[PDB]
CSV table of C-alpha atoms in Angstrom, one decimal:
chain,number,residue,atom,x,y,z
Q,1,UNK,CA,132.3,51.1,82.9
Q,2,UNK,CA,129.5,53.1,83.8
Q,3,UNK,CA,126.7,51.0,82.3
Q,4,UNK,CA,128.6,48.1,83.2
Q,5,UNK,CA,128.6,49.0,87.2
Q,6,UNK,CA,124.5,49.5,87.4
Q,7,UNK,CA,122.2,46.8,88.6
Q,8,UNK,CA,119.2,47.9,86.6
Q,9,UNK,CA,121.4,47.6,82.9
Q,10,UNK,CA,119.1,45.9,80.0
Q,11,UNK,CA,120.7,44.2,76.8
Q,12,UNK,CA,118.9,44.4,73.9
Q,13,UNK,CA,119.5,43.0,70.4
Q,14,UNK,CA,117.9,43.7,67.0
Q,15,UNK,CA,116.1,40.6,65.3
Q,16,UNK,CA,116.7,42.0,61.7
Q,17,UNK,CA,118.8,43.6,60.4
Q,18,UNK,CA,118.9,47.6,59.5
Q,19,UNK,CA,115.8,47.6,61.5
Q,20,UNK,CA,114.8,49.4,64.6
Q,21,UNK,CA,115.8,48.4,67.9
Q,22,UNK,CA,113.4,49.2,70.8
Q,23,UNK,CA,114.9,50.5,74.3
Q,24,UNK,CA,113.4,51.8,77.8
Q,25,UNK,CA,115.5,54.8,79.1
Q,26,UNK,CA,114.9,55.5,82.9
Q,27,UNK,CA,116.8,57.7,85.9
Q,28,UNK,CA,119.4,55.8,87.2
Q,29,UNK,CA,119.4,52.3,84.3
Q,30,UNK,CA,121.2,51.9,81.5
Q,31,UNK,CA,120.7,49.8,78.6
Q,32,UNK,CA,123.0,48.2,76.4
Q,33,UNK,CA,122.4,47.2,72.3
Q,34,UNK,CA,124.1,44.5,70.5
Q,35,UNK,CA,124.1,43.9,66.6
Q,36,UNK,CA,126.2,41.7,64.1
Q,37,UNK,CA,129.3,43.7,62.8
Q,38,UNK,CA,128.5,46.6,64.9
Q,39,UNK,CA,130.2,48.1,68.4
Q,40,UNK,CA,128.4,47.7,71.3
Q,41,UNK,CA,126.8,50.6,72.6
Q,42,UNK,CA,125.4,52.2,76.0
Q,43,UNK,CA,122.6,54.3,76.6
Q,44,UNK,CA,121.9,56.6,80.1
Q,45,UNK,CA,119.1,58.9,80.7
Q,46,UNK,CA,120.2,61.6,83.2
Q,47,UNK,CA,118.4,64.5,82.6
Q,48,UNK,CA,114.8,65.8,82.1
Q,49,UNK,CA,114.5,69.1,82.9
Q,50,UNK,CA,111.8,72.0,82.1
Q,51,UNK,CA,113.4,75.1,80.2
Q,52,UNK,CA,111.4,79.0,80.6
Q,53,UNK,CA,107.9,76.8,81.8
Q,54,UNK,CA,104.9,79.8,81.2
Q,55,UNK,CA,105.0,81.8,84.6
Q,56,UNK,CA,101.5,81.5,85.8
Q,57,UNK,CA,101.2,83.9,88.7
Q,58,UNK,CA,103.2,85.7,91.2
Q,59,UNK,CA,102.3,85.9,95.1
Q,60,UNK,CA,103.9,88.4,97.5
Q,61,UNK,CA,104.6,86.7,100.7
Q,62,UNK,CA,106.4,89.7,102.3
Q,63,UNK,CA,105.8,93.6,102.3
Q,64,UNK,CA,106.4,96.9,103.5
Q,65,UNK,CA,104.3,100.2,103.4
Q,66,UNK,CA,105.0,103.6,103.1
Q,67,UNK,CA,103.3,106.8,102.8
Q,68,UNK,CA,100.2,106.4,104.6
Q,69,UNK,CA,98.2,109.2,104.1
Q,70,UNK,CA,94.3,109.7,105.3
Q,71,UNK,CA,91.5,112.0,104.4
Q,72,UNK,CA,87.8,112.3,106.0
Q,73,UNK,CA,84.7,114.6,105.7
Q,74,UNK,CA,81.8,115.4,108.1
Q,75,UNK,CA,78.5,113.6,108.1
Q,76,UNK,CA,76.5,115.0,105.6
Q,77,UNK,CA,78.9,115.5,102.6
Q,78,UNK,CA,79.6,112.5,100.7
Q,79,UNK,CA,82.5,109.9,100.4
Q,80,UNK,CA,86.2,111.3,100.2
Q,81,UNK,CA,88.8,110.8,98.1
Q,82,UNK,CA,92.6,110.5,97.4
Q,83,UNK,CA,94.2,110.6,93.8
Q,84,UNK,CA,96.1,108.2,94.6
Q,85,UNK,CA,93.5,106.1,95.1
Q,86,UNK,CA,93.9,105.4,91.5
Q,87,UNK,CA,97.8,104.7,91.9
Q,88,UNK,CA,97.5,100.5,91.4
Q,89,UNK,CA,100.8,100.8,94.0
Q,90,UNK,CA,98.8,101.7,96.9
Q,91,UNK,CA,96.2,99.6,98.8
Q,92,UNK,CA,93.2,101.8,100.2
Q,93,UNK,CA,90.2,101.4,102.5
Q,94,UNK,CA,87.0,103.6,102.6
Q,95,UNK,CA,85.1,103.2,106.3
Q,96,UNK,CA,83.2,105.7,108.3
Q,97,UNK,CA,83.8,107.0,111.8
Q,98,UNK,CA,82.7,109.3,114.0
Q,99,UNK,CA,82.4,113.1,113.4
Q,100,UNK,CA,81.8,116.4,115.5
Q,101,UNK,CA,82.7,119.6,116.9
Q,102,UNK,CA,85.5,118.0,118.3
Q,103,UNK,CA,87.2,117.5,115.5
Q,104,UNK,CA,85.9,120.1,112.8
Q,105,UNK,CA,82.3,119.2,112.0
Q,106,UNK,CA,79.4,121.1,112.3
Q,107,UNK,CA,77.1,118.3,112.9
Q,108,UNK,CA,78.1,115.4,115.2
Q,109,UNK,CA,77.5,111.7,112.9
Q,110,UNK,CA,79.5,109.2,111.1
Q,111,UNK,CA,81.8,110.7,108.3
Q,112,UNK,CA,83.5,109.3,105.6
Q,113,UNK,CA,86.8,108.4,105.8
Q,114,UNK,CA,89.6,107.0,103.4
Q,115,UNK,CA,93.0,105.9,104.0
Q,116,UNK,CA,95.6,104.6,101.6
Q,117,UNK,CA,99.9,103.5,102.0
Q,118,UNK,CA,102.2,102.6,99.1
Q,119,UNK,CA,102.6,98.8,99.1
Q,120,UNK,CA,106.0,98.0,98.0
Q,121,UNK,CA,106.6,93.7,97.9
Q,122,UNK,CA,109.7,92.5,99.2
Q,123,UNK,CA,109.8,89.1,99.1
Q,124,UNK,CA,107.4,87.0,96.4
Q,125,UNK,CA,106.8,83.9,94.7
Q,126,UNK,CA,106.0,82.5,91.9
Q,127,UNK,CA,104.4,79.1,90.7
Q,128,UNK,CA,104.8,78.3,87.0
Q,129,UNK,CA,103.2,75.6,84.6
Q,130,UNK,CA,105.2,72.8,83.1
Q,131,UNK,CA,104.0,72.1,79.9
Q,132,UNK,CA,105.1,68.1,78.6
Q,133,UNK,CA,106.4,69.1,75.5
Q,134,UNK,CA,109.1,72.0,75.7
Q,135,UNK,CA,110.2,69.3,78.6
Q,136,UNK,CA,114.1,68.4,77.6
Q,137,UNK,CA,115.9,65.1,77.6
Q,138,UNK,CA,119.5,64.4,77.8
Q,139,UNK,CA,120.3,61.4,77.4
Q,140,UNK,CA,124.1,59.9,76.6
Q,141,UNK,CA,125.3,57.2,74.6
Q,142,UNK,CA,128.6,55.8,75.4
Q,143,UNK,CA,130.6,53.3,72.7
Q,144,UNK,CA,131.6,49.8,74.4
Q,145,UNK,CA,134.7,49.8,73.7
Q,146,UNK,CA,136.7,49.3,77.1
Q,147,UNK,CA,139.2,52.3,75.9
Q,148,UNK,CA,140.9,53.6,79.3
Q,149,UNK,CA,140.6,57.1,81.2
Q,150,UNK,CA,140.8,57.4,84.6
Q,151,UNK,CA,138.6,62.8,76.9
Q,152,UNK,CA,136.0,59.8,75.8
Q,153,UNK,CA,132.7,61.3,76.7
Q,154,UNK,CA,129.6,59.3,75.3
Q,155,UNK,CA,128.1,61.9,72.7
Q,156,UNK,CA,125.7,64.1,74.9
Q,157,UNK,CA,122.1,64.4,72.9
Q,158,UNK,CA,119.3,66.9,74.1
Q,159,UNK,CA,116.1,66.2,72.5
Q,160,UNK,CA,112.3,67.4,73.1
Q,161,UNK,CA,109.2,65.5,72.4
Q,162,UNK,CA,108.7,67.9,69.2
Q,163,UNK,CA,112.4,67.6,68.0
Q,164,UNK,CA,112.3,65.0,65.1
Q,165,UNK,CA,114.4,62.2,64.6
Q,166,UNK,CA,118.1,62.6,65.7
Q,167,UNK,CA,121.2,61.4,64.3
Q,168,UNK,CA,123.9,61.7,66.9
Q,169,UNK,CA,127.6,61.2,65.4
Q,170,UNK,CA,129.9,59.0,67.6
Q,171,UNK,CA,133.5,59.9,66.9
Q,172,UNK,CA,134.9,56.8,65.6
Q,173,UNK,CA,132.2,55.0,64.7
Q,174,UNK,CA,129.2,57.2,62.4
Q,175,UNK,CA,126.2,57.9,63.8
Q,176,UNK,CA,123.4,56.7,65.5
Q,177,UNK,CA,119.8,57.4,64.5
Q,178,UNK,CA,117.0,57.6,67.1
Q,179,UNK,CA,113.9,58.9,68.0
Q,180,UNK,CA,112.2,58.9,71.5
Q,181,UNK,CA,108.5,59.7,72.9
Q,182,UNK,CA,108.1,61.1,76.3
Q,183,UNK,CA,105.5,57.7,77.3
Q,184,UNK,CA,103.9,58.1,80.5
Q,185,UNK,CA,104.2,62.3,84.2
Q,186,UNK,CA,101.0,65.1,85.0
Q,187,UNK,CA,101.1,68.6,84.6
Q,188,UNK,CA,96.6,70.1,86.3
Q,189,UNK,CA,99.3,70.8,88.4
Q,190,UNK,CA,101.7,73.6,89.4
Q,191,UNK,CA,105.3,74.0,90.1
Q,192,UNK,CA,105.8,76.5,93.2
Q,193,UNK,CA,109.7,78.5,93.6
Q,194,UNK,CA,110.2,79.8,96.7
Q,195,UNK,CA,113.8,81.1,96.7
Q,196,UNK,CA,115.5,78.6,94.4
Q,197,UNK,CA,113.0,76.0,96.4
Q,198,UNK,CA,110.3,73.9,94.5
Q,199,UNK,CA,107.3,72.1,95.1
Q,200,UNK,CA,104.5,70.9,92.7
Q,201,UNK,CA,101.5,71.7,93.9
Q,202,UNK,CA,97.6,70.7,92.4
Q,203,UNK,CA,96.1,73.9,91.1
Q,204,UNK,CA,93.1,75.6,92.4
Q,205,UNK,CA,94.8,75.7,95.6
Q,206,UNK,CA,97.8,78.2,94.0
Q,207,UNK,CA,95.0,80.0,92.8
Q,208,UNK,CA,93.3,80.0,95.9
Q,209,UNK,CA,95.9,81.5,97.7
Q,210,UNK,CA,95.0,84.3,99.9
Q,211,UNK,CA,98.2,87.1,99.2
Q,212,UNK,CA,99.2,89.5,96.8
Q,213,UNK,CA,99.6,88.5,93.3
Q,214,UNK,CA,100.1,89.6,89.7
Q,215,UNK,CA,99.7,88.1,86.8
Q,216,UNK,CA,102.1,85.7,85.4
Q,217,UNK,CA,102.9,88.3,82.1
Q,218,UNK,CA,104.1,90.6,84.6
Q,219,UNK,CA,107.2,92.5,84.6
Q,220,UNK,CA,106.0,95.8,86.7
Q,221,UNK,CA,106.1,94.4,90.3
Q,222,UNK,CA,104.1,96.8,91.3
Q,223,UNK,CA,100.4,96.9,90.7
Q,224,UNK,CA,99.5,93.8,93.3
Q,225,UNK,CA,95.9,92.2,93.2
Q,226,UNK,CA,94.4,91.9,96.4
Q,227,UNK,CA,96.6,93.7,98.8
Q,228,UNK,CA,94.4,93.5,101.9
Q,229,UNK,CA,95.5,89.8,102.3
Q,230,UNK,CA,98.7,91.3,103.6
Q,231,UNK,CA,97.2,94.3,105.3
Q,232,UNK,CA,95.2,95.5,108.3
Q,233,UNK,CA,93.5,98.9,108.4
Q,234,UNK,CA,93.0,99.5,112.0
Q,235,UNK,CA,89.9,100.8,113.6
Q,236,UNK,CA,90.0,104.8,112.2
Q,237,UNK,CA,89.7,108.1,114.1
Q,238,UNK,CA,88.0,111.4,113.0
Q,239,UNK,CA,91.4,112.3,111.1
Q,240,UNK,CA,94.0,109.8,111.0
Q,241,UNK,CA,93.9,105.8,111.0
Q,242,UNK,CA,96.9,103.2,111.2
Q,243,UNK,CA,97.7,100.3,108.6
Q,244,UNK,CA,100.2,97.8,109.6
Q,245,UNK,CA,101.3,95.0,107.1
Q,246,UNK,CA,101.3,91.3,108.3
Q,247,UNK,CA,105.0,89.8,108.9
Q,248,UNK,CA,106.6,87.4,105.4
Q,249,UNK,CA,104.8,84.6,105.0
Q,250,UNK,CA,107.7,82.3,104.2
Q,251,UNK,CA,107.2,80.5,107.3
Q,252,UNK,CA,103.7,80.1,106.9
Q,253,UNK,CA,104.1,78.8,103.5
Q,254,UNK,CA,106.9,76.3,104.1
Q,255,UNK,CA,105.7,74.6,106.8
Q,256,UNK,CA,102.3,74.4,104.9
Q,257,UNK,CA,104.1,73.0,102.3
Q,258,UNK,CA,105.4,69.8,104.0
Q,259,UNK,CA,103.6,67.1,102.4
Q,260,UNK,CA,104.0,68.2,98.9
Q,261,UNK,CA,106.6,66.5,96.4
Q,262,UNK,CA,109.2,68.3,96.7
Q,263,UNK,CA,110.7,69.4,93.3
Q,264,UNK,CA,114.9,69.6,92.9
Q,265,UNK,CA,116.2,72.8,90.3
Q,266,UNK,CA,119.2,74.7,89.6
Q,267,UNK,CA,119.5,77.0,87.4
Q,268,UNK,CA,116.4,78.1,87.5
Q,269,UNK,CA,115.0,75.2,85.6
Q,270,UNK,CA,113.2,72.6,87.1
Q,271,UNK,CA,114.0,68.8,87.3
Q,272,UNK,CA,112.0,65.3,87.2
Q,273,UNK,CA,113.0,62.0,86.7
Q,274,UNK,CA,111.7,61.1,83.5
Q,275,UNK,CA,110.7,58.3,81.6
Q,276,UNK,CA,111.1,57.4,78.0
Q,277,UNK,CA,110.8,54.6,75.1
Q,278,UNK,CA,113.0,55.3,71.6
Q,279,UNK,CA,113.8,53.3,69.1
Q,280,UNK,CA,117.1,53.3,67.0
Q,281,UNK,CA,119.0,51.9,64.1
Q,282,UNK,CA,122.0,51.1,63.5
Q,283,UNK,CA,123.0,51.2,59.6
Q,284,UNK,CA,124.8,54.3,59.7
Q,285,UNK,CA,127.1,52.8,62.8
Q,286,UNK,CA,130.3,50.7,62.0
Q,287,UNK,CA,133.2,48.8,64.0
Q,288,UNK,CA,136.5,51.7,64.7
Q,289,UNK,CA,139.2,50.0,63.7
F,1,UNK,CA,109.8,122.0,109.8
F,2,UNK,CA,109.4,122.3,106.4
F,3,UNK,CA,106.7,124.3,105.0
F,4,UNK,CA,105.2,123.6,101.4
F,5,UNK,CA,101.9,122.4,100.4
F,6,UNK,CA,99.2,120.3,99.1
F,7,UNK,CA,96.4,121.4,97.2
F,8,UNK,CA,96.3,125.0,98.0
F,9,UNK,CA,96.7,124.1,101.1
F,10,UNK,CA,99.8,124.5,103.6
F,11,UNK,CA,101.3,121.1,104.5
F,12,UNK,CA,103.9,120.9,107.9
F,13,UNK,CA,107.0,118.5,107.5
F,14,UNK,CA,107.3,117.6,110.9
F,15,UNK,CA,110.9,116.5,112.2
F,16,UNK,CA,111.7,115.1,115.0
F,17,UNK,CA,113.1,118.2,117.1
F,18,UNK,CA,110.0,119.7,116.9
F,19,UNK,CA,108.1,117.3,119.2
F,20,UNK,CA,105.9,119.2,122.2
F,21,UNK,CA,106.7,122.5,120.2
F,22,UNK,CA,104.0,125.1,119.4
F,23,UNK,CA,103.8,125.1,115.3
F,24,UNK,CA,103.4,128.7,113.9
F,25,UNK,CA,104.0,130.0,110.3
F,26,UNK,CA,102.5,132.9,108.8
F,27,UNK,CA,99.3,133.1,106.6
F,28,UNK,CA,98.0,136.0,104.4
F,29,UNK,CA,94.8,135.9,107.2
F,30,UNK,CA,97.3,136.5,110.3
F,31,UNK,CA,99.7,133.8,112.2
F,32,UNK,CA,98.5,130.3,112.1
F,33,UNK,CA,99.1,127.9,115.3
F,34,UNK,CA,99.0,124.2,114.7
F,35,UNK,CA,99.2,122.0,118.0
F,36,UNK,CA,100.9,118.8,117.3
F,37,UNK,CA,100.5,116.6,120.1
F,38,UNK,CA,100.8,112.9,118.4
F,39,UNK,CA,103.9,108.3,117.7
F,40,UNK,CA,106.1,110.9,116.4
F,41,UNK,CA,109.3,109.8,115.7
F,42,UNK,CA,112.1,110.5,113.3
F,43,UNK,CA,111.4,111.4,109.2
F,44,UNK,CA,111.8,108.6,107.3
F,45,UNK,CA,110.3,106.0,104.7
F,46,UNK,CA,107.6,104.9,107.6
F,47,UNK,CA,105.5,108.4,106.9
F,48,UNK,CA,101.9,109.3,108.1
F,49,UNK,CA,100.2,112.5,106.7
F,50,UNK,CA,96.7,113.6,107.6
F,51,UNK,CA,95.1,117.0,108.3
F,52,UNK,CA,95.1,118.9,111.2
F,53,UNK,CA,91.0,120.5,111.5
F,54,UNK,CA,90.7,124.2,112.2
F,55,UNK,CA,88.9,124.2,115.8
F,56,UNK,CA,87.3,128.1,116.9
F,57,UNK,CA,86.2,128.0,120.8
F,58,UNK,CA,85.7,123.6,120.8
F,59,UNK,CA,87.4,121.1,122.9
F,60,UNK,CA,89.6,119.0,121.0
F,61,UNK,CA,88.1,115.0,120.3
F,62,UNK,CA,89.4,112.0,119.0
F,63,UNK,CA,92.1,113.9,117.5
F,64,UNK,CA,95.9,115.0,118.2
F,65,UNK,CA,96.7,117.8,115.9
F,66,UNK,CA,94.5,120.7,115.6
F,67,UNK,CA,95.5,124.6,114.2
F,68,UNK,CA,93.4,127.6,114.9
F,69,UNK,CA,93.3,129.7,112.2
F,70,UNK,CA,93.4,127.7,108.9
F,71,UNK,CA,93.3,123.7,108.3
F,72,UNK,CA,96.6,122.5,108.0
F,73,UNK,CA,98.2,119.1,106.4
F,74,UNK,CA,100.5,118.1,108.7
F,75,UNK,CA,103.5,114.6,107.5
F,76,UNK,CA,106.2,113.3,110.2
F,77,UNK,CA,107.8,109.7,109.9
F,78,UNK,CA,107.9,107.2,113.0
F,79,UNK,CA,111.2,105.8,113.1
F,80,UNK,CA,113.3,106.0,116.5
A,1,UNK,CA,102.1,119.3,135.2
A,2,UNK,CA,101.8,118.6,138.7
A,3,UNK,CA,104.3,117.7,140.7
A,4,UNK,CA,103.6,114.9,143.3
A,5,UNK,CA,105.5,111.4,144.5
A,6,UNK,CA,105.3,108.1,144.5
A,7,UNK,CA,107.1,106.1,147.0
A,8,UNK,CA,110.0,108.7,147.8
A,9,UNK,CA,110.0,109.4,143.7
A,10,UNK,CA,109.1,112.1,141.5
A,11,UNK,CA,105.8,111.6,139.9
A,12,UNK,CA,104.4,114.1,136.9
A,13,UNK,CA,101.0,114.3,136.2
A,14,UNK,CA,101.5,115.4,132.6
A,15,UNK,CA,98.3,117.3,131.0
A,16,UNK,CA,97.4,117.3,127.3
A,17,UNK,CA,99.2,120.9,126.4
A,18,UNK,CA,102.2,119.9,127.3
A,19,UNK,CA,102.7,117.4,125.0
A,20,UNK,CA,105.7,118.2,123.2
A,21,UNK,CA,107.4,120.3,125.8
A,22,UNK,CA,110.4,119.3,127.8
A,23,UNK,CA,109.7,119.0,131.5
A,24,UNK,CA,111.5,120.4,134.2
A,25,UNK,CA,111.3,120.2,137.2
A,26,UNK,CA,114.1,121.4,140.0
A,27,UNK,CA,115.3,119.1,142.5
A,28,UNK,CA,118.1,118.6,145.5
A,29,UNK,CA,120.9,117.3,142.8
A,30,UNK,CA,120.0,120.3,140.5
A,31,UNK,CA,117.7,120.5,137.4
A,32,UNK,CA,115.9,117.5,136.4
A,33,UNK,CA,114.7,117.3,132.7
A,34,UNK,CA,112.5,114.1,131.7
A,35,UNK,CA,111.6,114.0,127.9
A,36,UNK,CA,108.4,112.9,127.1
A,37,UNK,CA,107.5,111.0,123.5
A,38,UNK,CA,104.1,109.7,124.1
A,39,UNK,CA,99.0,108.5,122.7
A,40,UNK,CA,99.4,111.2,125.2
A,41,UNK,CA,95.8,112.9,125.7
A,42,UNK,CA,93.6,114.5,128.0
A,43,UNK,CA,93.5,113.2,131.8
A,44,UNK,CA,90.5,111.5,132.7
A,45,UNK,CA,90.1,108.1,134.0
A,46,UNK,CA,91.9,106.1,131.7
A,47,UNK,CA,95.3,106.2,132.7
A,48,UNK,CA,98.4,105.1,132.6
A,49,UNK,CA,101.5,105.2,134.9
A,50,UNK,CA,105.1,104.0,134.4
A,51,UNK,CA,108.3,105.4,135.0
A,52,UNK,CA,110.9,107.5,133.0
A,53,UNK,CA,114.3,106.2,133.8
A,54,UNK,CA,117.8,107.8,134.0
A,55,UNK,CA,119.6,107.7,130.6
A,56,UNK,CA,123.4,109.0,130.9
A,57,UNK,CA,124.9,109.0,127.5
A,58,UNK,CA,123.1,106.2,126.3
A,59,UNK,CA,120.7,106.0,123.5
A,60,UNK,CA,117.1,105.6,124.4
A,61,UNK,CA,115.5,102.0,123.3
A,62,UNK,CA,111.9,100.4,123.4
A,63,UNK,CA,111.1,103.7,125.5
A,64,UNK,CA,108.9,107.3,125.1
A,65,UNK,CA,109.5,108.8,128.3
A,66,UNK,CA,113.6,109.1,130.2
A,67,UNK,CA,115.0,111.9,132.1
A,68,UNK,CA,118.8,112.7,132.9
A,69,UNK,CA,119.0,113.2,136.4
A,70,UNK,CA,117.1,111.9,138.3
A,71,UNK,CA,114.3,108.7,137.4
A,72,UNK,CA,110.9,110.0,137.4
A,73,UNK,CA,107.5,108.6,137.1
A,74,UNK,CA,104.7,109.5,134.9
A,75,UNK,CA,101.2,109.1,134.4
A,76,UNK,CA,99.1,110.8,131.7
A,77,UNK,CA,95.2,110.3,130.1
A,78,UNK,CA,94.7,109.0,127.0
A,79,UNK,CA,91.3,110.6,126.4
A,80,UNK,CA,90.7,113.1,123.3
């Protein structure tokens, strides 16, 4: 009943016999093949979906700091330094500020002065790259038969462009061979998640991105590239300077998003609406009953 | 406050209670005062720790914690 | 500090070494302590001047400077 209650439903017929059949699968279409001696059967693309896509890079879009700790020296002897200037947690800032008796120095000139703070991230993102194979099909075939319900699934078939042939059993009936090729769907592109929220997005502008970020291979969190994006080291002072870390950036980012396909999920796993062309036969199928 | 250190050097935990309070912990070269005039708040996560210059017979600049015997690192959290 | 008014009100002219130290100061209803948690620094010409209100068992907010008897205004130098 399903195939039967689309508009865009296709019948097609095979001109020979034990031969392949050509079909079009599409989102939302059905089609419907026909042979001498054989049942009737329906076909239904309803999924294409991306499984574990390669995680390209991840942007912190919200932070906090913590342990902010400065160090300076007069004019005269050389550039300080904190250990944990060599912590990849913390961001750090070398400037130079005024000196003098005021405050410890011999000599009244500019000194050197460093300041660092543990970045932790709160709040990231992450855009990842959808390769076309590794992509995954479902795709349903349904018997014609009429039988009521109200138990009779069509057999449920997942295939991948690199999967080989298939030969899906239909209870009743034998099997169904098939095979199906993902023809023309792009991917210099990239495939942003913000919160269970996707976009696809053209690259070079993910990579452009001025925040926080880490490599896609990551599994740390901690040792963010590029900190300063999300931090501002405020003028210093002979012995002590502030850093204060820029509010999330989720707003920012969504509505600087608007424009850009927006891409449905669930699961984690991304969805399109995919296109395909198979071909089948039929020799192995036979009339139940 | 708590009194430990960093480097060699004494470092003051400064807690809340302790704001407008002369600092003054004892030192192998005699009693140290540390003035603390600073933002301070409450200790928490949100911690700032810098170092508090020894200052013999100079006015105070650009600065707001100072001891006057030996250098001191001084930490206290801004919470409220 | 020195002790002066403004409009009928208290007003303390807080110096830089009292930073950290409660203030008292006596008046008609009794003892009046303000509590100042200032960028307090020396007095010079950049100053500032706002007032410390009365807090009665109530939790100070989005405030550095509050007294419990009677409201009292403050001003202060933010020079080093």
């Amino acid at each position: 009943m399903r195939c039967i209650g689309m508009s865009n439903r296709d019948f097609v017929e095979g001109v020979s016999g034990g031969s392949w059949v050509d079909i079009v699968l599409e989102h939302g279409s059905c089609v419907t093949t026909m042979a001498k001696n054989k049942p009737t059967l329906d076909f239904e693309l309803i999924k294409t979906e991306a499984k574990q896509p390669a995680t390209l890079r991840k942007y912190c879009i919200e932070a906090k700091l913590t342990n902010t700790t400065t160090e300076s020296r007069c004019p005269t002897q050389g550039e300080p330094s904190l250990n944990e200037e060599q912590d990849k947690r913390f961001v750090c800032k070398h400037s130079m500020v005024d000196r003098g008796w005021g405050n410890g120095c011999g000599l009244f000139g500019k000194g050197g002065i460093v300041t660092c703070a543990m970045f932790r991230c709160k709040k990231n993102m992450e855009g990842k790259v959808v390769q076309p194979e590794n992509l995954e099909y479902t795709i349903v075939i349904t018997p014609h038969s009429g039988e009521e319900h109200a138990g009779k699934h069509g057999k449920e078939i997942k295939i991948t462009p690199q999967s080989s042939i298939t030969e899906a059993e239909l209870t009743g009936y034998g099997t169904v061979t098939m095979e199906c090729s993902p023809r023309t769907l792009d991917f210099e592109m990239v495939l942003l998640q913000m919160e269970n929220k996707a976009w696809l997005v053209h690259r070079q502008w993910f990579l452009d991105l001025p925040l926080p970020w880490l490599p896609g291979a990551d599994t740390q969190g901690s040792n963010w590239i590029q900190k300063e994006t999300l931090v501002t080291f405020k003028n210093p002072h002979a012995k002590k300077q502030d850093v204060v870390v820029l509010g999330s950036q989720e707003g920012a980012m969504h509505t600087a998003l608007t424009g850009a396909t927006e891409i449905q999920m669930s699961s984690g796993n991304l969805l399109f609406t995919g296109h395909l062309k198979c071909r089948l036969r039929m020799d192995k199928l036979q009339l139940k009953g | 406050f708590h009194l430990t250190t960093r480097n060699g050097e004494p470092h003051m935990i400064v807690s809340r209670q302790e704001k407008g309070k002369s600092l003054l912990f004892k030192t192998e070269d005699g009693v140290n005062m540390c003035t603390l005039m600073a933002d301070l708040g409450e200790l928490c996560e949100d911690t700032i720790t810098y170092k508090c210059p020894l200052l013999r017979q100079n006015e105070p600049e650009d600065i707001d914690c100072w001891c006057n015997s030996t250098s001191t690192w001084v930490t206290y959290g801004t919470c409220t």
